[PDB]
From a paper:
Catalase (CATPO) from the thermophilic fungus S. thermophilum is a clade 2 enzyme consisting of four subunits, each with a molecular weight of 80 kDa. In addition to its primary catalase activity, it also has a minor phenol oxidase activity that is capable of oxidizing o-diphenolic and some p-diphenolic compounds in the absence of hydrogen peroxide. In large-subunit catalases the gate and small cavity are formed by Arg134, Glu484 (CATPO numbering) and a loop of four residues (Gln185, Ala186, Ala187 and Thr188 in CATPO). The highly conserved four-residue loop located directly above the hydrophobic lower part of the main channel in large-subunit catalases is thought to act as a gate allowing access of H2O2 to the lower part of the main channel, while reducing water access.
The E484A and T188F variants were selected because they have a lower catalase k cat but a higher phenol oxidase activity than CATPO. The E484A and T188F variants showed a decrease in turnover by 53% and 48%, respectively. However, the turnover numbers increased for the E484A (sixfold), E484I (fourfold), T188D (threefold), T188F (fourfold) and T188I (fourfold) variants, while they did not change significantly for the E484D and T188A variants. The presence of heme d in the T188A variant and of heme b in the E484A and T188F variants was also confirmed by crystallographic analysis. When comparing the crystal structures of CATPO and its three variants, some differences can be noted. The first is the absence of the polar contact between Glu484 and Thr188 in the three variants. The fact that their catalytic activities are similar and that both contain d-type heme groups is consistent with this structural similarity. The most extreme example is the E484A variant, which lacks six water molecules in the main channel. Although the K m value did not change compared with the wild-type CATPO enzyme, this mutation had a negative effect on the catalytic activity. The channel appears to be closed in the E484A and T188F variants, which would prevent H2O2 molecules from entering the cavity. This is due to a shift in the position of Thr188 (in the E484A variant) into the channel and the corresponding Phe188 residue in the T188F variant protruding deeply into the channel.
Residue numbers in the entry:
A (entry chain D): 21 to 697
B (entry chain A): 20 to 697
C (entry chain C): 21 to 338
Write the structure that this text describes.
Amino acid sequence: SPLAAYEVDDSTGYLTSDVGGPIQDQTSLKAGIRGPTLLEDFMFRQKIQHFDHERVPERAVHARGAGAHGTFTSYADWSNITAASFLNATGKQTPVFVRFSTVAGSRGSADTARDVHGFATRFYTDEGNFDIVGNNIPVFFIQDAIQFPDLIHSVKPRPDNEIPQAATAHDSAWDFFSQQPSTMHTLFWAMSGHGIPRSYRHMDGFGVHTFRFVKDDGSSKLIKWHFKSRQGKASLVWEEAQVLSGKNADFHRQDLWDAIESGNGPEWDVCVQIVDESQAQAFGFDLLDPTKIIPEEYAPLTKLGLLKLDRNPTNYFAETEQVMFQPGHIVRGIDFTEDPLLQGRLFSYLDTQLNRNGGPNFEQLPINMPRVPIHNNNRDGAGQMFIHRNKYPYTPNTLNSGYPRQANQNAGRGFFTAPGRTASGALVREVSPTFNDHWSQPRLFFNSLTPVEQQFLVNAMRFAISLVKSEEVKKNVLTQLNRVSHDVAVRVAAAIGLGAPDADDTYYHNNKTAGVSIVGSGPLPTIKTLRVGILATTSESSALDQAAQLRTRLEKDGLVVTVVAETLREGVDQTYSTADATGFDGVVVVDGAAALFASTASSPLFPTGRPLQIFVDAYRWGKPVGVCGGKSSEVLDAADVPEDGDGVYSEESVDMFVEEFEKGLATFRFTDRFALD
Amino acid sequence: QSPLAAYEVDDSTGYLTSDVGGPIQDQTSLKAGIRGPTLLEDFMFRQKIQHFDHERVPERAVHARGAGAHGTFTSYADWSNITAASFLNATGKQTPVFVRFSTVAGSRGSADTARDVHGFATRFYTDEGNFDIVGNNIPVFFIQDAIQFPDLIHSVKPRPDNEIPQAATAHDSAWDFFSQQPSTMHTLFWAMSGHGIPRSYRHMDGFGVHTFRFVKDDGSSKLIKWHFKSRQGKASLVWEEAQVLSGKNADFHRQDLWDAIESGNGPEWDVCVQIVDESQAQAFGFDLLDPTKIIPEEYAPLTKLGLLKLDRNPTNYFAETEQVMFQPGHIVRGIDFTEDPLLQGRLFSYLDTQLNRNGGPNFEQLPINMPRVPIHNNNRDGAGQMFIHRNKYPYTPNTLNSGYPRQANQNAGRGFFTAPGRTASGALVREVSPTFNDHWSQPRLFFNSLTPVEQQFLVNAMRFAISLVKSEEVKKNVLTQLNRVSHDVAVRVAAAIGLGAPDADDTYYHNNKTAGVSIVGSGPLPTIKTLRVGILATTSESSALDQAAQLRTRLEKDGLVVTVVAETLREGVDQTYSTADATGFDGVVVVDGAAALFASTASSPLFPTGRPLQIFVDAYRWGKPVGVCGGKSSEVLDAADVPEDGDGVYSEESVDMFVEEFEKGLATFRFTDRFALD
Amino acid sequence: SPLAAYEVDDSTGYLTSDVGGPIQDQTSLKAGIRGPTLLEDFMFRQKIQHFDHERVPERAVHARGAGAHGTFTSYADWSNITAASFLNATGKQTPVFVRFSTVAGSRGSADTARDVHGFATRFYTDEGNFDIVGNNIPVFFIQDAIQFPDLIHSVKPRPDNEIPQAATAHDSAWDFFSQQPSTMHTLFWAMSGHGIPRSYRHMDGFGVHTFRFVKDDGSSKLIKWHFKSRQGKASLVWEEAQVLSGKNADFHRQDLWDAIESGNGPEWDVCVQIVDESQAQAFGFDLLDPTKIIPEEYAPLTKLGLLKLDRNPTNYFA
Ligand code: HEM
Ligand code: HEM
Ligand code: HEM
Ligand SMILES: [Ca+2]
Ligand SMILES: [Ca+2]
Ligand SMILES: [Ca+2]
Ligand SMILES: [Ca+2]
Ligand SMILES: [Ca+2]
Ligand SMILES: [Ca+2]
Ligand SMILES: [Ca+2]
């Protein structure tokens, strides 16, 4: 409804051309009933021309994504730290649109690739659109925007054959990573569970760069943006993510869409670290360096307000595909820093919309329009929608009484550059030596994961680097990993038949920081929307009765229940043929269905062994699993699952089963099922 | 104008903002120190300059030079008896219009008063969809098949090695094409007449050119020609006037239209048709599918359908005039195409060319292109998509959107439908109908139907144009074609270029004439409102200014645009001699108090030597009503070598008597006895 | 001939599609001799699509202009003041392309409007393309690039009716000039004969901005570019310019084209003023200010080499 003024209703009426002439569109005009098609058929040509021209260029990066409408609510009057109008009163509401994405894949690539993820937020503020174009990882691969095409060429498919679409699993990517050691920190994040988040709702957003908050009095503070998920942090496991990339390439957009439709619209606390201008070089690194975090121990998070996504788009193309974010969409109360990565982005996002939109009036697209008046002397250009009344669009003028008026620090609530900002020195294409430690923070991150988490990251690196054909690249990779951790280099090297180089302890240390572990972030604060697959059978009325009883008690607590059986009927959502363990956060077998789990079981209605495969996959990927009804050992023995296993449930009582199982869904993953080196 | 009103942006108050509503400045770049380099992070600089860098769109492939205005069409009757068309279905029914007038060959910025064919494109924003009649001021076209359009247009546009010259009809390639493609002769004769240099957009007619069909709700059809007949009357420039006006005021026609509308003198046309039976396609001595032919009015009279009035200027020229995208494909139920091969191919071109101009497929969403009725269709996405479509099942046939939108056809939904009587029979051919082969009779009919002096103006336009052709061989080929229309024309043209005309070839010669194609013959203007009177005065004689004031009052009440001219501006003086020229006026009056300025000793640092007399003598030589108000009128006329007995020369002591006579002169408009004949 | 590798010859042969299929292009394919045109007529659609898409956007400024090929010849080894390879040896030749232009008018506006004029030179150097994008007047209207759209909106036609095409003869232009006094120096040049030059060949070219010459040792000097006409300076008179705008809108492009075809290819001495970094504020104004000239009495011209235009284009558009 925030874009209701642009909506077109086709629930009634006769087909028209784009100029409102009623027409047909089902049969071409022909010279006789078996004749050739006539050039004078305007109905044909106008419809096919539109179809022919439907597609626009995909985004150069973050081509794969999904968006939703929502509201931002301020917790306070933040005048004391920023002039930003959207933050100036307790409870002040501002409409938002968010797009989540992967980075490397083209617009049809699977959601559950291993990748960095985007988290872009537009605030339609009463002083203009403000965009925070962030990622789910707080540090970037590179220290200077000029290097972005080198990064993205190296991670994107090899340009002779456009193979492979596995961003982190080919020679060219590891060549870049190993020759550009700045990459180590973001690389360690991408090789962790942060590279395969369970959903958009179960990851954070980060501005990455230091920005400024600027008060009306002109004073400034340095800030980092942190959008902290109220759903909690969760990952897939790789073995799961690969299958899910085939069974459901749309998994993350469907999870978000379903959460909003079910009234479970995801929430983030929008937070900042605030530090003084004097602390730019005080934390043992440069706040202008986007490869570095400020440990929460040095600067705590201040909660500014609530971000809630609660409305799906009406038309995906018009809203999600066409949304054009820019870090240059800035408001009074915010300013840039001399982060050489941020500095260059400001150019890129204004320029790239010419490519996507095919013309300069992209801010006039409904999704890009602000919610306040526009007063400027911008004119003409392809696709001009506005009819400007002012016939003297120049400053300075008298013929339009000197309107529009210049807005600045002192008049018209103008944007203004933080007036304490200076530059001094040579005009240089030189890197600050303050940027030169590429390895300490990667080690900080690694140090801050749990032992099983550390194993998962080593395993992601073993997987990816084992696919690199070049022996010289694999050696260069072990040289860089070794500068972060000798142990990581030895464990990765073991997988690929190379020796790790000798320990180089220059950057080694045992410092740790809170808030970067997924496994370590404890049970989820809510299980609403989590997916329970109930494996039943049509062959036993009592199996369906057990399933209906389990459904009622699970749905009461807001879980999404799928009853699976051989065929569809009342109370069965999916067939075994379409069901998979990647479809569920937990799997329950009703003991009336135990016959389906025998090695002997066979049906033309589903692939050999499908019922037991769903159970075994779910167990092996660490999910809560169990048998409800009391007769558990036929199913558990066929699955090779121990009855006494953590996150393995066997109860006769539906009530006791669900109370135990719901604890399992909160735990989310049972990490004792994964081997350690 | 719902879509146009909704998109209007008022900047009469407020602080400068970005396109996303963030208040900003735009006067100083952000720099690393007061004498420092400009910063990349200056988003205010880049958004403003990016917009500026992208302001321009491709000009139209043809008709690039033009001007537009809003108005209203009012039907005179319920025309159900001849057409299903909803805009014509009731007495007094009003439909908003937008019209764009144009030249053909010139680029943007080329002068209005080039010798050229002119566009007259009319959009009817009807209650059953937008209906465009994309016409010209000349009722016949150069060529008989749309596939030839790039050949014609390459030949008339500047030579592509050096892009010289801008003069469409005055270079080798144009005459090469005309002489090798004899279909061109009829349109060529029109463009070489006064129709090539109209006095204004308001003083020319509009023509559909092609035969179209009127289709009734019973499926029956008739063949029609569109004629928009000026209520201002037909009038031309003279060539030497046009050439000077091209330099003094390249915006003459757009300014004339703008000024007429602002003054409450919005131009009008009777929208008319010739209506003939399908059985008459080949009855009139030529093929109605041939766009090089008119139906003589003597064979098929004009029926007045309604009133076209232009009465509102655009708010933003670029957004409305430059972006308006006309299409003969914009047709409504009750109208149908014919198998005219020129029309047939147009239908493809205008849909395709808007992709070039707009840079994307959503050009019908621009406010000027939008309809005034709801749009229901399954067209989706594309660059610049401005709609948010609620229907998530945009396919036919569907159940998931309850089968909407519904198909519209002859039976239901007031669907467009092809005239059900239309058939095709025969081989699939790239062959020209032999019924199209007479390229010379109608050019001769047109030539025959002009007055003797009008024939001289046409001979003289060809003498001018053909004399600039460098190729002797192209000039000979031209005489060969002209000779097939009229031996006399070929003899008279040949004299100017030092060649002999070929021997008479009487195959296509005849003495038939037709009413309604002559300008010189069309009689006095039915109104003199908007016509321009230059009063030549002096600041050096209070009596000269009083005379000019008394004339101004007396002429302005009759709706004439009066310019008092003197050495310097003051109260009552609109213009200096320095900026004034005879091309700025329809009539020129000298007040006898100004007599002293019309001598040969003359001279002022405030205007070129001889300017005041040059304005009067140019006015006389170009056929305009000219006169002296005073009583020493005797004298000044002698200075100018202008005879007092002269038709359209005035000489009256009384202001009241001077004006009465002078105003008859303005209606006569041109005094053609001032032009030498062969 | 410097672009000979890209030339297409149609002095012989049979008509083909863009993919080399021999075709015809004079009659549409119809369902019978008096029939409607067929959609399957690919000869028609490929030809008319090309025609329909011939036009590109005109330049936002300097839309009206004309170009020619030529040669630049260095008079010396300029190592002493610049590392620039095209200046590194006596007699070193570099191909050039030059375009001359007005500023305000659209691409079919008369050459002889009163206006500033463009003089844009490309040196196709052995160390890359070097462009000097200059005007025939050495000073600009405005002191900051962010003001360009204000200047150009004010001098271009009024945007309600696109009237008038006379850059310097309407309210908005004079409103801008009177509110933005920086415009006075360029305005005086545009109101002199410099606003209506006799030809592109009878005007000079100016870089306008102070640039730097940088030696291979890293030392720098401040320079102004001055292209000095070997044909001499000449103007029209205004009344003449106005008539010529109607009688021959192509007058300057024709003058240039004819001079080249007659073997009178126009020449300029490419010159610089060279001053020290320390003199940025020494001449009574700031060298960073593009509304100011360095008087020749303060800094004489140095001749660097010869610019000669001697070859017309083959295809104007391309
Ligand atoms: C901190 C580093 C970065 C972050 C967090 C980031 C984030 C993002 C995100 C989230 C998107 C997708 C926005 C959407 O969903 O529509 C995006 C797109 C894009 N980014 Fe960045 N980015 C970063 C660095 C860069 C750099 C250094 C460049 C270029 C120099 C760049 C150029 C682009 C381009 C061209 C697009 C496509 C934008 C569009 O089509 O609208 N990014 N980025
Ligand atoms: C009876 C013959 C014709 C008439 C009366 C005619 C009339 C016109 C008019 C008045 C315009 C200007 C519309 C405006 O003001 O925006 C125009 C534009 C155009 N015409 Fe035609 N025309 C004719 C034949 C053709 C043919 C045969 C072709 C191509 C095969 C053609 C292609 C075009 C194109 C490409 C444009 C530019 C359209 C645009 O950019 O909107 N015309 N024509
Ligand atoms: C000393 C000041 C300037 C001079 C001498 C100058 C000169 C020129 C010339 C000669 C051209 C035409 C080049 C050609 O023949 O193709 C041109 C085009 C252009 N100028 Fe400038 N100019 C100046 C300042 C500016 C400024 C301040 C801006 C914008 C911030 C600007 C933007 C442009 C644009 C957009 C074009 C069209 C370029 C193209 O389409 O290729 N100019 N200028
Ligand atoms: Ca590779
Ligand atoms: Ca994990
Ligand atoms: Ca494009
Ligand atoms: Ca020629
Ligand atoms: Ca039909
Ligand atoms: Ca003005
Ligand atoms: Ca002079």
